[PDB]
Ligand binder design. Structure first.
Ligand SMILES: [Zn+2]
Length: 105
């Protein structure tokens, strides 16, 4: 597996959950500031999301500052999932692309 690309054109994406079904039977709650971070830090937005006032555009890499906004938004109740590129859905057979990997070099 190696990053060798051009933005892989296949946009099939994963949606990262901000809520979990069962610590206590059923009660929706905001995931931890950590796990959520793990899921969306420096990722590439598959589709555009308008949340608290700002228009996170498509393909934008979300900084930790941005993944700090989305939670602040899920706190308010504006989003329950997040559209985002990922290696699980890449088209580059042997390899992964810039937009699907993300930030973290
Ligand atoms: Zn890709």
């Amino acid at each position: 597996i190696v990053v060798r690309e051009a933005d892989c054109g296949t946009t099939n994406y994963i949606s990262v959950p901000l809520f979990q079904p069962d610590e206590v039977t059923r009660s929706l709650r905001l995931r931890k500031r950590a796990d959520i971070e793990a899921g969306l830090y420096g990722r590439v937005l598959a589709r555009e999301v308008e949340v608290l006032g700002v228009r996170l555009e498509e393909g934008r890499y979300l900084s930790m500052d941005d993944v700090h906004l989305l939670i602040k938004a899920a706190e308010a109740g504006e989003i329950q999932e997040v559209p985002v590129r990922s290696p699980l859905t890449c088209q580059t057979r042997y390899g992964v692309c810039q937009k699907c990997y993300g930030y973290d070099l």
